[PDB]
From a paper:
The bacterial member [name] is part of the phage shock protein (psp) response that maintains structural integrity of membranes under stress conditions such as temperature and infection. The main effector of the Psp system is [name], a 25 kDa protein consisting of six α-helices connected by short loops and an elongated hairpin, where the N-terminal helix α0 of the protein remains unfolded in the absence of membranes. Interestingly, [name] is related to eukaryotic and archaeal endosomal sorting complexes required for transport ([name])-III proteins and has a similar structure. Here, we show that rods of bacterial [name]-III protein [name] internalize and thin membrane tubules by overcoming the required bending energy through progressive membrane binding of the N-terminal helix in the [name] assembly.
Due to the critical role of helix α0 in membrane interaction, we also prepared and refolded an N-terminally truncated [name] including helices α1-5 in the presence of [name] liposomes. For the truncated [name] α1-5 sample, the total diameter distribution was narrower and ranged from 235 to 290 Å, with two maxima at 255 Å and 275 Å that were closer but not identical to the apo distribution of WT [name]. In the [name] α1-5 + [name] sample, we determined a total of five cryo-EM structures with resolutions ranging from 3.8 to 5.4 Å supported by visible side-chain details. For the α1-5 [name] variant, we found only five rod diameters (235, 250, 270, 280, and 290 Å), whereas two different symmetries (C1 and C2) could be identified for the diameter of 270 Å. None of these structures contained any additional lipid density in the rod lumen. Although the [name] mutant lacking helix α0 shows no structural alterations in the helical rod structure, it can no longer tubulate [name] membranes. In support of this analysis, when we abolished the α0–membrane interaction by removing helix α0 lacking this binding energy contribution, we did not observe any membrane internalization in the lumen of the [name] (α1-α5) rods in the cryo-EM images. Interestingly, when the protein was reconstituted in the presence of membranes, the ATPase activity was increased by ~210%, while the activity of [name] α1-5 was not affected in the presence of membranes.
Numbering used by the authors:
A (entry chain C), E (entry chain Q): 169 to 217
B (entry chain L): 113 to 168
C (entry chain G): 24 to 56
D (entry chain B): 57 to 112
The structure:
């Protein structure tokens, strides 16, 4: 049991050391990549259809 | 009846122990946090630029 | 020399930006548990 | 101080460009949040900007 | 129990050391940011609509 929670603290301490992405950034890196794939592919689906 | 009732006491008491131990971690963590937050705001107060015997 | 305190006082503050860094780690650790 | 100001505006420029990506094509709402986020970075730029002029 | 109130005093003593914002200031930092976002975005919603 103490092993498991010892692992929990190592991972959690790393998170504050290197914060995970904010949801706001998460929304665009998918939202923009959709056109970053579709817009390039919209050019491709127009360029190369 | 005696053996069953006494076991109930132990079962009830054992649960209450680990519950208390969980709270000890939280209260200590908040305390060590609260004491720390104070002195940054105090050392800042030493250097705060407030014209209150501030070094700056 | 008053100018020397400015360095040492800031030196003291480097201890808690890590110490308080431990306090958050413990709190998040308890939350995960 | 000059270098720090340049970095801040680059992040604002990136968020500016990111809002220049958002507001197009009908999604002004995500631009609102991005601009709302951008305002935090805009404030930092203004404060450093005048200090650089004063320090000159 | 004495731990909890001991925490109360540490936080409260810090508050007088560093006062929290007055409601008057609170009213504008939201009220101005609305146009600080809308006015910039009103320029954007006019500049970039």
């Amino acid at each position: 049991e103490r092993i498991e929670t010892k692992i929990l603290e190592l991972e959690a301490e790393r998170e504050l050391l290197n914060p995970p992405p904010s949801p706001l950034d998460k929304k665009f890196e998918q939202w923009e990549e959709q056109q970053a794939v579709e817009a390039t592919l919209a050019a491709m689906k127009a360029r190369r259809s | 009846a005696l053996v069953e009732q006494v076991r109930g006491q132990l079962q009830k008491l054992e649960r209450k122990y680990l519950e208390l131990k969980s709270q000890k971690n939280l209260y200590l963590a908040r305390l060590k946090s609260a004491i720390a937050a104070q002195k940054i705001e105090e050392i800042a107060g030493n250097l705060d630029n407030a014209s209150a015997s501030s070094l700056f | 020399a008053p100018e020397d305190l400015l360095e040492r006082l800031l030196g003291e503050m480097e201890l808690e930006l890590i110490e308080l860094r431990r306090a958050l780690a413990q709190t998040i650790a308890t939350f995960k548990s | 101080t000059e270098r720090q100001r340049d970095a801040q505006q680059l992040i604002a420029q990136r968020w500016y460009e990111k809002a220049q990506a958002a507001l197009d094509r009908g999604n002004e709402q995500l631009a609102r949040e991005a601009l709302g986020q951008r305002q935090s970075y805009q404030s930092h730029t203004e404060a450093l900007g005048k200090s650089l002029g004063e320090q000159r």
